[PDB]
From a paper:
HYS, which has a distinctly different product profile, was also crystallized to explore the structural basis behind this distinct stereochemical outcome. Reactions with THAS1 and HYS performed at different pH conditions revealed that while changes in pH did not substantially impact the product profile of THAS1, HYS produced increased amounts of ajmalicine relative to tetrahydroalstonine at pH 6 compared with higher pH values. Both of these mutants gave the same THAS-like profile, suggesting that His127 is required for producing the ajmalicine (R C20) stereochemistry. Interestingly, a non-proline cis-peptide is present in the THAS1-NADP+ and HYS apo structures.
Crystal structures of THAS (here referred to as THAS1), a second representative THAS (Cr_021691, THAS2) and the structure of the promiscuous homologue (Cr_032583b, HYS) were solved and mutants revealed key residues that control the stereochemistry of the product profiles. The HYSs perform a single, chemically straightforward reduction reaction that immediately neutralizes the reactivity of strictosidine aglycone/cathenamine. The active site cavities of the HYSs are framed by helix α2, the catalytic zinc coordination sphere, and loops 1 and 2, with the NADP(H) co-substrate binding at the base of the active site.
Numbering used by the authors:
A (entry chain A): 4 to 357
B (entry chain B): 10 to 359
Write the structure that this text describes.
């Protein structure tokens, strides 16, 4: 029965035992390194609002005991006999999923993140324990080749917040030099969205409800224009100018002004999840043939491509590195967005054997 | 202008149509002049004639979907000879020198010239003679009937364009059509010819029988039954939604596979309530679409001819036009009125 006795590789980390979401030391086990597997010592594990939501069981479908960790990097300790991509001592990353059915339309076409049988790394779809623990093991297919010129501690949120912004920027053709790209909201998702857009060669506009952020965007993100969305004169002046908009705002807001900012054939991408639904008048879409698209996560192909891109363009996240016994306080901070902009748990140095 | 013409026009916002004399330009070097044989009409003309939106230039000659026969041509005209058949859709000019123009989507130009005069100072094709720049004239194939083909230049292009733009034109795909009206019935016909397994989505049980029996539609979902809608969750590559009435699209997004596309073609007054999770779970999109470009329109006409696609139409004499307008209001026509200008437009008495 007991998780530590199931498999032969003994592991330890931190787990939520109930819907209170309190993380505490947890012993468990993982499979032996099979022929196609990559075992690794976890060095850093990102976290974010998704883990707050899951750990407190916001959707009523969490399986306790729950071990977070959908954005992890570490150092390879063992490789199976048929592994190509890694040798022992190489760095590796694991994102949101570790498996899929490998046979459906989605899998066959390299978009296996959309597999109805996708296997979440943290085991919210399936039975699995996430990488906030000492040792991880993963099928080669689902392991990111992590280059030595991409810092681990500040790179790790690319596997969560990064791919989320990068994927739609490529999918909707918002990655060409000289395009005008808007980002709404300068937080976890938006800050990386800006760094990607800049690297693609876009003229970047920050759209925001707070003037505080204007100076930040200009000084620290090289942002070209700032639009305060509560200022209609400012907003109206940029009508029909943006090729696309990455909307990261989690608060209730209207997207009709955002649709109006787009050129004809332009794209609104929604990445935040307000509790308030959006009100979308048919005419706002039909005038100029505009689209609104949602996006979460990305494929393995897209995730490797992004990490390669980030390494080459020196793109990392703003992070606060924390010891693992700070996890429960970090969750409180995530609740209040009191982090600039992502927590990264230093597992390598601060997780000790029980 | 010197070319002496006559047609029908509305004078005030009553929307009443009567004989109206006017004139067009002589044929320039890039121009095609034709005798009008058929003139499509639709809800757009009802709205513009009654000044729904408040920016209608009177007197208003309708006719944004017309066909006929070439009478004369300009010096530098390549695409037409005299006696050929020809069509004109919803715009006759654009600025030519902008981004939207250079890339072949001039319908998105902000200085775009409407055939009916609405963006511009023009008179539409509900009249004896037309003249248009050759770029904005469609080459009409001999095996496409004129009377039943003319509404393609409006309803046809409107359904065809997004089917192409959003990759919903591949054989084998599961394509939903919501609403079986004017747009709906041509959307079904195009999707069938592309090779798709078509599902009709409708609020009306009457439409189930119509879809199977008359369009060879595979599947039907009633959108007021949650149990039937639940059973098709995550099965469709795209939906073409033509419904003009207030309705939720949260169920429609739910019908889409991951990476699936919802195309809005109707224009309800009620806005759509769209929860973020409905777009985000599956990475789905909602896009608007009306009309299309000249390249696409010509291409759509060749495809319609090649695959025996026409609209269902009621051909009407011109003195029925005012009655036709109450019937367009009541949604009482299967599925588009086509005015027999060629046989029924009389020349005004001297
Ligand atoms: Zn995360
Ligand atoms: Zn699969
Ligand atoms: Zn029409
Ligand atoms: Zn133009």
């Amino acid at each position: 029965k007991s998780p530590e006795n199931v498999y032969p590789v003994k592991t330890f980390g931190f787990a939520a035992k109930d819907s209170s979401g309190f993380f505490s030391p947890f012993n468990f086990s993982r499979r032996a390194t099979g022929e196609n597997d990559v075992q690794f010592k976890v060095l850093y594990c990102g976290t974010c609002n998704y883990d707050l939501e899951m750990s407190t069981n916001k959707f009523g479908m969490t399986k306790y005991p729950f071990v977070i960790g959908h954005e992890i990097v570490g150092v390879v300790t063992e490789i199976g006999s048929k592994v190509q991509k890694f040798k022992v001592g190489d760095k590796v990353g694991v994102g949101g999923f570790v498996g899929a059915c490998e046979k459906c339309e989605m899998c066959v076409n390299g978009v296996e993140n959309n597999c109805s049988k996708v296997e979440s790394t943290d085991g919210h779809f399936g039975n699995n324990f996430g990488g906030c623990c000492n040792i991880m093991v993963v099928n080669e297919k689902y392991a990111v080749v992590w280059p030595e010129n991409l810092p681990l501690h500040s790179g790790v949120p690319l596997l969560c917040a990064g791919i989320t912004t990068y994927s739609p920027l490529r999918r909707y053709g918002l990655d060409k030099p000289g395009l005008n790209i808007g980002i709404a909201g300068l937080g976890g998702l938006g800050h990386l969205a800006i760094r990607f857009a800049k690297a693609f060669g876009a003229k970047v506009t920050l759209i925001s409800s707070s003037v505080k952020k204007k100076r930040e965007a200009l000084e620290k993100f090289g942002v070209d224009s700032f639009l305060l969305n509560s200022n209609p004169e400012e907003m109206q002046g940029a009508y029909g100018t943006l090729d696309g908009i990455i909307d990261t705002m989690p608060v209730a807001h209207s997207i009709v002004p955002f649709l109006a900012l787009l050129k004809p054939l332009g794209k609104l991408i929604i990445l935040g999840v307000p509790e308030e639904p959006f009100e979308v008048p048919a005419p706002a879409l039909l005038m100029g043939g505009k689209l609104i698209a949602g996006s979460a996560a990305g494929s393995m192909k897209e995730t490797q491509e992004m990490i390669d891109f980030a390494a080459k363009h020196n793109i990392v996240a703003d992070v606060e590195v924390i010891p693992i016994d700070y996890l429960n306080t970090a969750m409180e901070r995530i609740k209040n967005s009191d982090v600039k902009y992502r927590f990264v748990i230093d597992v390598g140095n601060t997780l000790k054997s029980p």
